[PDB]
């Protein structure tokens, strides 16, 4: 639909089409049930008592069809929280980090066997034991 949705971010007014939000339905804004909580029937708007600067990027992510660029003026820690909040999902988050210069370290393989773990830990982690040190 092209029915218009008004999202009020701490007083800063945003408007978009419902079909722009519906595009991603796993998200807070894209899911009727999740955003219901924030609806103000007196003013016909969803209200969020949240950081203002971050939002355009969040909205543009829907309008652009996937572009999640952090605004230059917004700290990476505040933005990432906002992303978490609006539930944009792990994919968007990863791409965002990657583009932000953070490389996943993945995970480190584990011995499982009690002995190897016992040994491997003091031969590669001085951290693991005072003896390892």
């Amino acid at each position: 639909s092209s029915e218009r949705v008004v999202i009020n971010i701490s007083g800063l007014r945003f408007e978009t089409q419902l079909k722009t939000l519906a595009q991603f339905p796993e998200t807070l804004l894209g899911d009727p049930k999740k955003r219901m909580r924030y609806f103000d029937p007196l003013r016909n708007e969803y209200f969020f008592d949240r950081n203002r600067p971050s939002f355009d990027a969040i909205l543009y992510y829907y309008q652009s069809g996937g572009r999640l660029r952090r605004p230059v003026n917004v700290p990476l820690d505040i933005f990432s929280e906002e992303i978490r909040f609006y539930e944009l999902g792990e994919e968007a988050m990863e791409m965002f980090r990657e583009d932000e210069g953070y490389i996943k370290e993945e995970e480190r393989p584990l011995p499982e066997n009690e002995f190897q773990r016992q040994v491997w830990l003091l031969f590669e982690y001085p951290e693991s034991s005072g003896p390892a040190r």
């Binding site: 029915e3 218009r4 219901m36 029937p41 016909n44």
Partner: protein, 326 residues
């Protein structure tokens, strides 16, 4: 469990059952009966009576209006509603234009011998009239003291939401209720589309034809009884329905439901009506009745309501096989 409930989230309190006047008043029954039906209903706590400019070409309003005047009931103890779309043969006598809403409501009020109705309805959506015009007209009649509230009949959720947003945009009054058809064989709108609206903007449902005009009563298990609505002149289309392949399938499903009714210790009409009330989103069910016996039986649906457990509801859904996907 509570006999009375808010119409949607408005402050208007209606009984969970109301009495309609389609087909009956000024038509199939004699005003002596009509008075009897209202009297009976009013004495049983029912405060909601629904009519329309189109029923019997205005005579339903005249009869309803006369009874209220003759009985002397206090106007403040009643919730009268009227629905407007088709008010005349002339081009300008139908629709939701400002002209027809004002003129149609004014003429109904005259036939009802009433200063105002509690809720005025748009009997169906109007593609030919801007929402703004309709919402401003409804808001106008309310400000003129011709109605206390307004609602939509037969609109889609999308349209209802449009009326609401148009109302917020221009500082007008939003509708507070949608009058939707609802019974075991017509579940889709009430059980899938209206709930969101109820929780989001407070619009409640006031459902009609809870017995699908008598079809769900079980009275048609063996053919078309004499003097039944299906046998009335003008109601052939109903007759065609009952006897149709789909009609047969319904009647067969009704036989399955009868066992549920007996389990719950009630009659099928009572079960059918109570079923309509199992969900909060429904504010009230408008009943139809051609005699006093029917009304006295149907009112008993209120005793069934507490017994509709999830399990029973599941069982019914299985019998019906038509539970809409959310």
């Amino acid at each position: 469990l509570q006999f009375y409930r808010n119409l949607g989230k408005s402050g208007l309190r209606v009984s969970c059952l109301g009495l309609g006047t389609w087909v009956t008043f000024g038509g199939q029954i004699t005003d002596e009966m009509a008075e009897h039906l209202m009297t009976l209903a009013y004495d049983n706590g029912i405060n909601l009576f629904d009519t329309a400019e189109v029923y019997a070409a205005g005579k339903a309003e005249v009869v309803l209006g006369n009874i209220i005047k003759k009985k002397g009931w206090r106007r403040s103890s009643l919730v009268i509603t009227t629905k407007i779309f088709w008010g005349g043969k002339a081009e300008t006598e139908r629709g939701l234009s400002r002209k027809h809403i004002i003129e149609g409501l004014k003429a109904s009020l005259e036939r009802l011998q009433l200063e105002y109705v509690d809720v005025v309805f748009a009997n169906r959506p109007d593609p030919n009239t801007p929402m703004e015009e309709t919402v401003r007209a409804m808001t106008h009649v309310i400000n003129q003291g011709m109605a206390m509230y307004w609602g939509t009949s037969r609109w889609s959720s999308m349209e209802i939401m449009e009326a609401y947003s148009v109302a917020r945009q221009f500082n007008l009054i939003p509708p507070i209720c949608e009058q939707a058809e609802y019974h075991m064989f017509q579940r889709e709108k009430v059980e899938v589309q209206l709930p969101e609206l109820f929780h989001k903007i407070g619009v409640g449902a006031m459902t009609w034809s809870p017995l699908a005009c008598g079809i769900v009563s079980g009275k048609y298990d063996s053919g078309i009884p004499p003097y039944s609505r299906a046998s009335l002149k003008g109601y052939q289309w109903l007759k065609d329905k009952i006897l149709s392949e789909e009609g047969r399938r319904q009647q067969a499903k009704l036989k399955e439901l009868q066992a549920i009714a007996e389990r719950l210790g009630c009659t099928l009409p009572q079960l059918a009506i109570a079923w309509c009330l199992r969900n909060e989103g429904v504010s009230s069910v408008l009943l139809g009745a051609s005699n006093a016996e029917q009304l006295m039986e149907n009112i008993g649906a209120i005793q069934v309501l507490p017994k509709l457990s999830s399990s029973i509801v599941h069982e019914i859904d299985s019998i019906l096989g038509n539970k809409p996907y959310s």
